């Protein structure tokens, strides 16, 4: 009976990740009419075309000068030696006028993406963050209302009701004519997905009792890893975003075919300090885990192999966490895992020349360190806390976590313009600070 749950988890997995494949930024330069005619007339080499015609000149910096400028000259009606065409028209850099790119952009890719189709390249670069912001806002708004809708009609109709919109919205997004409809369909699809996956979690975990719940708590990570791995194969044979979206949508279609309370929890001065430390590490780890994947998906030399390798090293983290639960206290693995995350980034900021060989080893270590630190919190939660039925307090806490997750893409993307290695300092600071707070957890009054 686990096949259904595994399929549902593997279908949910690409939703939070698909921005890596659906939208990517290839190397571009805007179109200047008059160079293609000269290229075909004089037999200009295509590889060396961007050496005598590009306005970026020096590759260092020049983000605006290379991708958002043109050498506005009279390419036609001009006689040239067909060696250095600009050696006589201008005879000097910065002594001839520039301007904004007008006709369009020429991209270097065999496939297509959202950036290529809608031209979010020069001054609309901030429009790409709306893609994740709308999904996170839908995740935020879906938590509050999913409880109310399931009461008046029961859980039988709700589960079937919310597994059809997730496919219809995907198909319609694959058949979208303009940009705003994509955002509307993205929000409508993200309203219900987290609630569906959360309901499936409990539906799968109903049968498992003591011990069995722990054993099946890792099968739901194994299925997530399997779904993450199987997505890299589809993006290799379908290099068009419409085709990939239509190929990952229809599976779901065929798939469907006195008492404990938050009041007692806070007045006691010993159970009040323990939770303000446990509900902050979760926020920090979620922020780091969300940010690292998006950072990797923007500066990867070869995206297909790094993404494949970043799960075969995430697999043994659960095994290590399950190994180290019996013979070792609960704060040493947490402290070590939180310390391993900061040092990885602190070294990543400093390896310039031979970074390509060492990144696939260091980032895997960082991913493993983050993966270990999340399972321990869940195990402690299961061990120590009772069975709360359903609480507006937990609902508000999840809403606040989604509020925190909404802001992250803007800071991740828009802070990289000032300096390339600036977002890798906040992560290190958060990781190093989250290791010094876990040392206040042990009770110092009469511990022995």
């Amino acid at each position: 009976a686990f096949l259904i749950l595994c399929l549902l988890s593997a279908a949910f997995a690409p939703i939070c990740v698909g921005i890596v494949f659906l939208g990517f930024t290839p190397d571009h330069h805007c179109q200047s009419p008059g160079v293609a005619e000269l290229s075909q007339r004089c037999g200009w080499s295509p590889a060396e075309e961007l050496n005598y015609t590009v306005p970026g000149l020096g590759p260092a910096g020049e983000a605006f000068l290379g991708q958002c400028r043109r050498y506005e000259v009279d390419w036609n009606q001009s006689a040239l030696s067909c060696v250095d065409p600009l050696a006589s028209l201008a005879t000097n850099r910065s002594h001839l006028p520039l301007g904004p790119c007008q006709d369009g952009w020429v991209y270097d890719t065999p496939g297509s993406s959202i950036v290529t189709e809608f031209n979010l390249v020069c001054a609309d670069s901030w429009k790409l963050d709306l893609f994740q912001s709308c999904l996170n806002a839908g995740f935020l708004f879906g938590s509050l209302g999913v409880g109310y809708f399931a009461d008046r009609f029961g859980r039988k109709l709700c589960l079937l009701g919310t597994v059809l919109v997730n496919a219809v919205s995907g198909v319609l997004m694959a058949f979208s004519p303009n940009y705003m409809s994509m955002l509307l369909f993205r929000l409508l699809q993200g309203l219900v997905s987290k609630g569906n996956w959360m309901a499936g979690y409990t539906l799968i975990t109903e049968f498992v009792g003591s011990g069995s719940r722990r054993t099946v708590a890792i099968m739901y990570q194994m299925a997530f890893t399997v779904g993450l791995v199987a997505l890299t194969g589809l993006a290799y044979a379908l290099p068009h975003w419409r085709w990939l979206q239509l190929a990952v949508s229809l599976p779901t279609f065929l798939f469907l075919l006195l008492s404990p309370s938050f009041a007692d929890l806070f007045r006691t001065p010993r159970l009040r300090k323990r939770t303000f430390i446990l509900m902050y590490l979760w926020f920090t780890d979620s922020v780091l885990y969300q940010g690292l994947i998006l950072h990797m998906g923007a500066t990867s030399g070869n995206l297909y192999l790094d993404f494949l390798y970043s799960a075969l090293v995430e697999i043994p983290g659960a095994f290590i966490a399950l190994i180290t639960i019996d013979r070792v206290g609960r704060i040493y693995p947490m402290a070590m895992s939180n310390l391993l995350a900061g040092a990885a980034c602190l070294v990543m900021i400093f390896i310039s020349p031979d970074l390509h060989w060492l990144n696939i080893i260091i980032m895997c270590v960082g991913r493993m360190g983050i993966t270990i630190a999340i399972q321990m919190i869940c195990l402690v939660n299961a061990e120590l806390y009772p069975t709360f039925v359903r609480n507006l307090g937990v609902m508000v806490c999840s809403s606040l976590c989604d509020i925190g997750g909404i802001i992250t893409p803007f800071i991740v993307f828009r802070l990289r313009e000032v300096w390339q290695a600036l977002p890798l300092i906040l992560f290190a600071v958060l990781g190093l600070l989250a290791a010094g707070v876990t040392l206040l957890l042990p009770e110092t009054k009469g511990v022995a």
């Epitope: 009792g209 003591s210 011990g211 719940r213 722990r214 006195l258 404990p260 007692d264 929890l265 006691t268 159970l271 019996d326 013979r327 070792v328 206290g329 609960r330 704060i331 402690v380 299961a382 061990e383 120590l384 806390y385 009772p386 069975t387 957890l441 042990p442 009770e443 009054k445 009469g446 511990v447 022995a448």
Partner: nanobody, 118 residues
Framework: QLQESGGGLVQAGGSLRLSCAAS????????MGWYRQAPGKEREFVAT???????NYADSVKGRFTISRDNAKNTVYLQMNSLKPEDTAVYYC????????????????WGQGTQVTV
């Protein structure tokens, strides 16, 4: 506030039931256990239980002792059958500290226990 009960005298291969009474605050958010004094020796370890229901046991007493949790009476039970002659000591109810040590050898509570003999 921990309080133990039960105890008595047995001849050979008997059965008796112990009981640890909690306060209500420590019942839901803590972990309970049982420790054996073993006079003339350091204190021993028997079994634990947590909120999920996962139980641990000692190798010497495995297959003989059974621990169960009761929610209506706010008590933690322990059943001992077919007692060996070595099983003779006073038994303490304790609340171990998970975050420090090996997880079951640091105590922050006790209840002074009760005596049993064979």
């Amino acid at each position: 506030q921990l309080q133990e009960s039960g105890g008595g005298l047995v001849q050979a291969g008997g059965s008796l039931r112990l009981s640890c009474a909690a306060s209500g605050t420590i019942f839901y958010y803590e972990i309970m256990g049982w420790y054996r004094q073993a006079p003339g020796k350091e204190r021993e370890f028997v079994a634990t239980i947590d909120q999920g229901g996962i139980t641990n046991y000692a190798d010497s007493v495995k297959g003989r002792f059974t621990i169960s949790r009761d929610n209506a009476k706010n008590t933690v039970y322990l059943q001992m059958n077919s007692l060996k002659p070595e099983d003779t000591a006073v038994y303490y109810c304790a609340v171990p500290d998970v975050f420090v040590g090996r997880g079951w050898d640091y105590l922050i509570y006790w209840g002074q226990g009760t005596q049993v003999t064979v």
